[PDB]
Design an enzyme around this catalytic site. Structure first.
Site, PDB file in Angstrom:
ATOM      1  N   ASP A 161       0.249   3.761   1.736  1.00  0.00           N
ATOM      2  CA  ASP A 161       0.199   4.246   3.127  1.00  0.00           C
ATOM      3  C   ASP A 161       1.592   4.577   3.640  1.00  0.00           C
ATOM      4  OD1 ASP A 161       0.100   4.230   6.085  1.00  0.00           O
ATOM      5  OD2 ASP A 161      -1.952   3.506   5.812  1.00  0.00           O
ATOM      6  N   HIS A 189      -1.802  -4.408   4.896  1.00  0.00           N
ATOM      7  CA  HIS A 189      -1.601  -4.014   6.279  1.00  0.00           C
ATOM      8  C   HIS A 189      -2.933  -3.814   6.987  1.00  0.00           C
ATOM      9  CE1 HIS A 189      -2.573   0.360   6.012  1.00  0.00           C
ATOM     10  NE2 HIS A 189      -2.342   0.128   4.734  1.00  0.00           N
ATOM     11  N   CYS A 196       0.831  -1.199   0.000  1.00  0.00           N
ATOM     12  CA  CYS A 196       0.000   0.000   0.000  1.00  0.00           C
ATOM     13  C   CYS A 196       0.863   1.246   0.000  1.00  0.00           C
ATOM     14  CB  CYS A 196      -0.928   0.004   1.220  1.00  0.00           C
ATOM     15  SG  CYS A 196      -2.178   1.332   1.234  1.00  0.00           S
ATOM     16  N   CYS A 227      -5.936  -0.552   6.998  1.00  0.00           N
ATOM     17  CA  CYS A 227      -5.811   0.088   5.693  1.00  0.00           C
ATOM     18  C   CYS A 227      -7.045   0.900   5.353  1.00  0.00           C
ATOM     19  CB  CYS A 227      -5.554  -0.972   4.604  1.00  0.00           C
ATOM     20  SG  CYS A 227      -5.329  -0.318   2.928  1.00  0.00           S
ATOM     21  N   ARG A 229       2.829   4.790   6.361  1.00  0.00           N
ATOM     22  CA  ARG A 229       3.290   4.028   7.511  1.00  0.00           C
ATOM     23  C   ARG A 229       3.854   2.657   7.145  1.00  0.00           C
ATOM     24  NH1 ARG A 229      -2.380   5.137  10.402  1.00  0.00           N
ATOM     25  NH2 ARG A 229      -2.927   4.368   8.304  1.00  0.00           N
TER      26      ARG A 229
HETATM   27 ZN   LIG Z   1      -3.389   0.932   3.112  1.00  0.00          ZN
END
Ligand SMILES: [Zn+2]
Length: 209
Positions: A42, A96, A40, A99, A44
């Protein structure tokens, strides 16, 4: 604070050259990663940090909710380059927990263009609606769908002619599904690894060229 990023870069590069003056020069001569990471976008979930890798080690694709869609030439081109040109030995599909893309697929808000991008996750949630319904909290539903999503993408990757033709010609190649905990920093195996044609349903097995 863009200037900080430039200053950071200069400090980073110089420090590395102090410890290994040839680190970049050697790396620049050839790209030889053994892994492709599909994960992803993302912020993080950065690939190298999570698995303790260095520049040069992981070929990376990241997109919203780490989906591998049948007619997405973006991700498909990464897979083709990785498998045919770089000959990576492993594809790591990493989703993850928590998400946002997955979460949005369980809710009924319009997000915009992303509606289409995420609708396969919505379809997956619909397919597993009875299973998800057993789970008492929204966070449990989201986290389980995050897992289901990774498992579907592993299957998708394994169904491509890119992967199957690599196997046909004797290339060693495994597709793995993992899930990362943004709450605990832990990268966990979903144990859905596919390494050869014999592991595919007959409906997905392509005859060799
Ligand atoms: Zn995600």
């Amino acid at each position: 604070a863009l200037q900080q990023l430039f200053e950071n870069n200069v400090r980073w590069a110089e420090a590395i050259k102090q410890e290994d003056p040839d680190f970049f020069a050697k790396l620049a001569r050839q790209q030889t990663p053994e892994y492709l990471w599909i994960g992803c976008s993302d912020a993080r979930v950065p690939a190298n940090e999570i698995v303790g890798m260095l520049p040069g080690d992981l070929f990376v694709h990241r997109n919203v909710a780490n989906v591998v869609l049948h007619t997405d030439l973006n991700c498909l081109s990464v897979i083709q380059f990785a498998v045919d040109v770089l000959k990576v030995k492993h594809i790591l599909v990493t989703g993850h927990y928590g998400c946002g893309g997955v979460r949005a697929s369980l809710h009924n808000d319009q997000l915009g263009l992303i509606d289409g991008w995420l609708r396969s996750i919505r379809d997956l949630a619909y397919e597993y609606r009875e299973h998800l319904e057993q789970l008492p909290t929204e966070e449990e539903r989201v986290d389980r769908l995050c897992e289901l999503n990774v498992i579907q993408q592993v299957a998708n990757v394994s169904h491509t002619s890119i992967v199957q033709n690599a196997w046909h010609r004797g290339q060693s190649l495994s597709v793995h599904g993992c899930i990362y905990g943004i709450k605990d920093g832990l990268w966990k195996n979903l144990n859905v690894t596919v390494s050869g044609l014999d592991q595919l349903p007959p409906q997905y097995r392509l005859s060799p060229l």
